[PDB]
Subunit: 28 residues, 4 copies
């Protein structure tokens, strides 16, 4: 369903934001 699929997208965005945050630390 649409809400289930939007929930999966939000969880994926959360993992993508943590990856960015981690890249950013490494480099600084």
């Amino acid at each position: 369903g649409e809400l289930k699929a939007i929930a999966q997208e939000l969880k994926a965005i959360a993992k993508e934001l943590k990856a960015i945050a981690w890249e950013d630390k490494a480099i600084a």
Copy 2:
């Protein structure tokens, strides 16, 4: 950090959307 905290918020929103989607099914 701020991105880590926003990631947690997005994961929490995903669980809240699935709960809404489930409530909605039960009732329909």
Copy 3:
């Protein structure tokens, strides 16, 4: 950059949630 593109995705999702709120 990337964060702006993610922000745009979140805005698009917001619009989708408002639409779901008002369907039958």
Copy 4:
């Protein structure tokens, strides 16, 4: 209702992400 309030949260988060993109 609730979904609208979540949509508003997502928009607020979008603004926070754009701000992070432009800090040092």
